[PDB]
Amino acid sequence: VINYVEKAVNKLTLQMPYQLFIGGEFVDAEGSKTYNTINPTDGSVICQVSLAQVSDVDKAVAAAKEAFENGLWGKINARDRGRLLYRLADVMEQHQEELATIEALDAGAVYTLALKTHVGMSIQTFRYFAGWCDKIQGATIPINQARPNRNLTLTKKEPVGVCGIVIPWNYPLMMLSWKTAACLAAGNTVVIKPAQVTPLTALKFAELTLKAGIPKGVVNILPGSGSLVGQRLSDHPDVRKIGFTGSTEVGKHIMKSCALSNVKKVSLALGGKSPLIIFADCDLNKAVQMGMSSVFFNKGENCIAAGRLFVEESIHNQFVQKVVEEVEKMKIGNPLERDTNHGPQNHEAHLRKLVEYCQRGVKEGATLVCGGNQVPRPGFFFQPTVFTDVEDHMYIAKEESFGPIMIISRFADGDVDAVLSRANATEFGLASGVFTRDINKALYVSDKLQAGTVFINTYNKTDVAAPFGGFKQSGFGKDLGEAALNEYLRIKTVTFEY
Amino acid sequence: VINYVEKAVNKLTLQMPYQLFIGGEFVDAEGSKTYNTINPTDGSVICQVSLAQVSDVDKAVAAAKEAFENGLWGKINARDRGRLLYRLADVMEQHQEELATIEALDAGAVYTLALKTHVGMSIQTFRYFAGWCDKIQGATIPINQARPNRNLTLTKKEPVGVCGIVIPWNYPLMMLSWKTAACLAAGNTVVIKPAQVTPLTALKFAELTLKAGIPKGVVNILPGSGSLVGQRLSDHPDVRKIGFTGSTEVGKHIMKSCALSNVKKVSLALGGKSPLIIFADCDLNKAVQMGMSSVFFNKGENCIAAGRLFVEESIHNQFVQKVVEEVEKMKIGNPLERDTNHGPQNHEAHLRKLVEYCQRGVKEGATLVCGGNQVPRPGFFFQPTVFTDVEDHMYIAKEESFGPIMIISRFADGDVDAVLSRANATEFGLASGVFTRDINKALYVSDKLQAGTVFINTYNKTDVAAPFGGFKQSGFGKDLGEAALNEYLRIKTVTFEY
Amino acid sequence: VINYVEKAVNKLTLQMPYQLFIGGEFVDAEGSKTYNTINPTDGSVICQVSLAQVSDVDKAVAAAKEAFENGLWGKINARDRGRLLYRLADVMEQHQEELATIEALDAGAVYTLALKTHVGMSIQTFRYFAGWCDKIQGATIPINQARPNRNLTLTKKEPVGVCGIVIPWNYPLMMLSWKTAACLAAGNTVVIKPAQVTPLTALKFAELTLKAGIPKGVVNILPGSGSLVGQRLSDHPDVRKIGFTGSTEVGKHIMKSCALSNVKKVSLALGGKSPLIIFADCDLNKAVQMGMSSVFFNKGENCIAAGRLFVEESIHNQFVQKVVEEVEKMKIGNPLERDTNHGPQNHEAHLRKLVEYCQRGVKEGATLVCGGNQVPRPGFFFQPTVFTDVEDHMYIAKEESFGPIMIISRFADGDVDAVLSRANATEFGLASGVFTRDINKALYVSDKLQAGTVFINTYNKTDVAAPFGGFKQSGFGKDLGEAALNEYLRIKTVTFEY
Amino acid sequence: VINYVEKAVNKLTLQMPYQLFIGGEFVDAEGSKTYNTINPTDGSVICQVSLAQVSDVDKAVAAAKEAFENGLWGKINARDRGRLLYRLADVMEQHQEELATIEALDAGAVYTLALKTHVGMSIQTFRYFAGWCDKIQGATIPINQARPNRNLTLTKKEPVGVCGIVIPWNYPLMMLSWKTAACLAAGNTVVIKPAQVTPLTALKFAELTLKAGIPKGVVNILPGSGSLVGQRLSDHPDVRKIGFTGSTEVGKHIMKSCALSNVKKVSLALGGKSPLIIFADCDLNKAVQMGMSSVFFNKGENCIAAGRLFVEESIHNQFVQKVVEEVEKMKIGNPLERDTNHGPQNHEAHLRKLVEYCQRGVKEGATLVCGGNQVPRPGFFFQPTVFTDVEDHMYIAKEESFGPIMIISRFADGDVDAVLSRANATEFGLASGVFTRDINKALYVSDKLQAGTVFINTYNKTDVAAPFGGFKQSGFGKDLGEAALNEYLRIKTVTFEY
């Protein structure tokens, strides 16, 4: 029997595994080491969670290797691999309320949003990639013939093997799902390291793989520290690919580690400072609604969040007035209250960074219009914040807050190339957006923006079929869409003479 | 007017540029520094070549950046970019004898081979990729609609920008062409670092880009050292991708440097220890001819060379006997002489390694059947070598010679999985081959071999349309074929709401 | 509430609808006209089925048009269309025993085969194409730019609209599923005409679309005659595409009718006379098993059945002896009995044709080795038959039997091109096969065979992912695979200047 | 030595073949039959041209069949087929002034336009498709495995064989080139029937195939009548595919003939009545320029010409005034004169139809604003024409003029869905257009338009890389782009068990 932490909450009795998941079983870490996971709504300890050690990483990688090389997963038809992944999505759907509640408790995700996005999109991801399994195809190629003989050349798409995936804490289940679905659909096996601060939905997910009948060792989950677990995964001689999502600085380190061990493949989904350009010829009330969402969605803990808004001079003051009006209407509180719009920040150290970020913004001369502070109440709540009079040289015009902080600059009426230059003057390149009713401006701006995703007259519109990844120091490689599969496949060329 | 080293040779008058090529002009390096390039047929100095410095790398990158951002290359139609690359191929064709002669002098490539392969395949590479320019396409994707509104999602394929490419010395022009053609077809601009020991066809190529009308700064060429030029390219904040071909150990360093600077993209085409499995049921005389070619082609300086031959017990002794007869018929000599079929090794340091390699082979207990030594004559000639009684634990069963050394092991009659296990017991995974008349065996073996390319009843059958790249510590990414374009493109997702 | 014909059989209760299915309801035909459907196991009447009239065709097309233009099917996300088709496959699976039993009663399909193939592959088909819905993608194309302006060109894949599909009787549910799954996945609506002699699984399928929640009018089913119902579908001005499977002569008429009405798109999956070439170097015992399967599978009522076997002279006599021995072992009888492996022919007129076919074979001088007659028991059973000494000019060498009749010719030892000529001497080109252990022969023969499918060392190996269709007078267009979708999609090119 | 009609015009000496082109030679038709080709600028006879008979069609098809089955074209590498097609494009470019002059004499094409489009796009078409030859690729497919055995399934793309193509007279060389280039790139051989009235560029093209070294019999050209030559091509037992461009009514007959003979594949590029919707929020002066182009380009002999303009009420009168001002500036004259804007109609019978068309427009009650008449000068010139107050029930609202007649209707301010319904109320669906600055309207309207091509803020923007084809009674199949290749290829599925 699996040991659970039991909790009666949100009309449910949650049953939460808290141990490492290796080779299809929940097990204590070496020396039974544990750590505390903290509820951000009140700062209380949810439970103790196993703290993976090096020997545990080695056990997990060994179980993944055996599952890949000798287990059922490497033998079944691609179509049957698809069936299992569809079934996993069904099991996740059957537990969707429980998963969303766990995400509310562990990450501070507003429950209504967690149902639809954190969990709903996770389900869509497994279903989408389940469909790809038997539709991954190689080629036959019309090469030059070695006359008087003949040649046939074909390519085969094959799995890469044992993969390690390292996940951040902002959407714990969803970020896990994005990478894991594509990885498994391609026929690989995996060791997953969730962010230390948010292990619980990953562990519940591990249990669901058992209910779905995923063969033992195909999925292994190791809560613990990046500097220990993530490091060993990146160094391991039997891991052939790392999928990493997190900060640019840690990304650099991970890629270095892959290089120095066995030149394992790596994908890097790193930070952003994404610009949103709002022209005077946009629908203004819609621009305010979408502009607010671009910043405040999931309490700003959103890698594609608009980190600068450029607003055309003639509409700037009305835009800011409408924003302040809307911001005052936002309900801050417990993620389980059904009218909550704004939940708490994910953990204490992040809240403190946001406090300092805003002090720095004021110190360097930006205008704090509203917010800027921790909300006085238990837990780790931060006020929705608006800065104006932001200039291009400022720290807050360059650095990603990863919090609910709207950072506004004017641009001159009738200018286009000049605002584009400013929007592109970052080493990041993850996302961007443009609001305008003018088809010509919309198309030109989307061409010129140096970012992996461009939203036109919307924001935060990701989709499991639409590839997602950054340019420049936001990294490389895609999650989602057909393109995600390529990170997890290798191509073998086979050439016959006959 | 360009400064040339003039040489009357092979019934031609060679005109060889010898300077750095930056922003469409031939220039001396900082401080007029130079180094000598050596003719491997007699060990003499061909000429002095400019020795690129750090300031020269920065100039080249700046010229590439300007050509990309502001020059004609970034403005013209993809179709017209194609026309220029085709014209480049035509200019190379018009200079084919001259290019093949330069490759004979600089790399010791046998002239008849250089004409057909080194140069002939380079021409095919530019023509093939010229065809791809206006056929690189993105997608429109059926995402979920934000009802009552509608959504359109498309992807755009865009160039990555300024690329650095670092090339080895075994097929100087061909290896340059593989990477450069795909890079340029994708709309990028490039800084190329040829191997220090083989700069001359690259510099002549640079002049041919002028004749073809390639805009200034699109192609820049920096002869010099890897530890200086290559390092600065991998470190440079304006370079966005490195394409690297060379040793696994240098590959590890390159990738690390990419990580620590600006997480530039990297492709790695590294070493191999490729197995060739010869079954008793093959066509024996053909297996001898193709087995010969798998080792001795281009004096063994061939990344896909068979590094181990596994021969079935019942035909082993007859195979070895027939190989020896054919080895004895090989004419060793000056690459410009028409009856030469074995030219000299590329440079002195490589010759020294081959000598040491065979010393270690004999020391550890392998049977040296013939060769193993430098040929007594001027230059850097190495006697075609055959080892038998090679056991799996031996150094020469594990390490890549990159020379004309056939390394033969036996396997028991009727065994298949046992010989596959041995063939796959390497950290490399570049190429492999199987000779057999049995359809079932050929298909099963090609499935089970852990290599990026599998040859069936042939060897060394590369084609510009067929992708080429390794698994495991042989690296990642493809040269050739449609797949090669992906390394040099980025995908932007554009999502509208309307 | 739906009216059923109820029957207790095969350890279940069959509930069979027997009326037309139009706009989501079961309804009598005009004038309450009906016809009898006949059980081929005993010659008895299963039940009366509604006989669709021209006015019923018009009602069905109108319901399909309305469902497409104004109903939910034309409004929902592609992903949600996928969900509904996956639910339909689930519902089919829940009713798999019932469906397979109906197929045994209506078509004479051996129940164990029907469960695995007739029904099992139908379920796979819906699941395969359900996965395609949100993976059907258009392109973005790098066209020449009208400088100083810019251009964006994309393609959109759109449904064709109302489709008519006309099905033969050999695999009633399976043939329906092949076409219907691809058609619906592409977002079309459909009017289906099952063969008059086999309406029952189509009508049960109709009921299952209600259980799955497929919107009204998306699927319409019209049992009746081709000369009436099929004709009107091909003539109808609101039908935009016809998918036809059947004889070559009816296909000609269908295509003509499409031309003369509104140039509706058409696919034709027509007859075949498929050659199987068996070389002396094959595995003989396996060649007998697979050779028998190529002819006798599904009592020979199989469009891809091998219609001629060419057997190398040196193994001919031993092959024929072994076939005769295995034929004697076949259990002919009631398709619901578990030991049965040869069921009755589909209907009486077909049995009569087979009797006449074999009489003609004997008259023209072929050696009847075994079979040739009706089996002396109730229903329409025909003996598994073997002819030898078949010459190229013979009627039975040219005409498709569509029954369990093995038609054997010799070819000289060592001939390859000579037998290929004879194998290709037909205006048909549906399938073909070759048995040999020789890799060079297999690859060469598969190149040279003029047929849409070539099996190598197997036969009857169809798969929902592998496209299926003929060449020459076997028609054009594919069922199955990604390729099938193109028959049911139209491409809209959209070009912007900005 | 080829017989020519020599003519000194346009500062060149034209050398025009005038005979049938069969199996690499120019030959007289049976009984030395001829007909006159007429210059539309003055009505004079240019020369006598061979008049192909049935026996001549049989000779051409035989030559094409021999070239495909036994000639060099079926033996060479795909890459070398590409080389020949690129050489063909080069030869066409070397003769571009001569070809453009012939097109001016034969078709009345304004010379400056013929250089850029009639000939310029023809050259681009051959270069584009030349690049496809070695990039046409099949697939490897992950089918279910027949355990304990394994399966490999691949597809091969193969040529269809002998094709017949039937061309109209509006862009004689360009229409020939569209179809011929894709057909030959796919590896087929061809018999071409140019429109009887415009045979000369086709015959000159034939001679250029000799200069380019295209093997004899690969291209055969038969000037003559459709009811004889075209009919026999559609009926021929050795022809496997017909590519037809022309009227809907002849298309119907063509498809019927394909049906009744050997179910040869057919593509149909038929008529159009393409709508152009102009919103009040467009750029008006640009809308006038592009609106005029949409009608008057190539004297209106343009299958995608806007056959109706719907103009928003508030801008209608100003739009009409501006069009009138600009029409008065058009220079009507000899197509060889550099100042000519508007050349003569293609032939006399077509001119007479246009006169009758405009009489009927006035009779039925539309307002004739300008033009409507034959210009008073020699040859077959027609005045650029503008109708307003066109109602939906009028003949000129339904029928394709195929001449320079702008047919304008109003729609109410704000009335998007209503104008769409009117624009879609046709059985044609070839092209369409929308002018608006509003991104929402542009995207919504392009979704809703029932046409194969939608232009947004432009018109007549075709490109060799963008597929072109209609919906509904405008036919099916694409010319141009990757999609065109599928009409000229067949897919063979090869499935191994091992």
Ligand SMILES: NC(=O)c1ccc[n+]([C@@H]2O[C@H](COP(=O)([O-])OP(=O)(O)OC[C@H]3O[C@@H](n4cnc5c(N)ncnc54)[C@H](OP(=O)(O)O)[C@@H]3O)[C@@H](O)[C@H]2O)c1
């Ligand atoms: N290539 C493939 O995928 C494939 C698969 C299965 C079978 N087949 C071929 O099908 C043939 C066996 O079936 P069959 O001989 O019974 O075929 P068939 O006579 O051509 O009938 C096929 C269907 O067409 C209908 N039909 C007849 N006349 C029509 C008309 N004028 N307009 C529209 N529809 C009309 C028939 O209706 P009724 O019910 O009234 O007869 C039946 O539903 C064999 O040659 C076999 O190879 C091919």
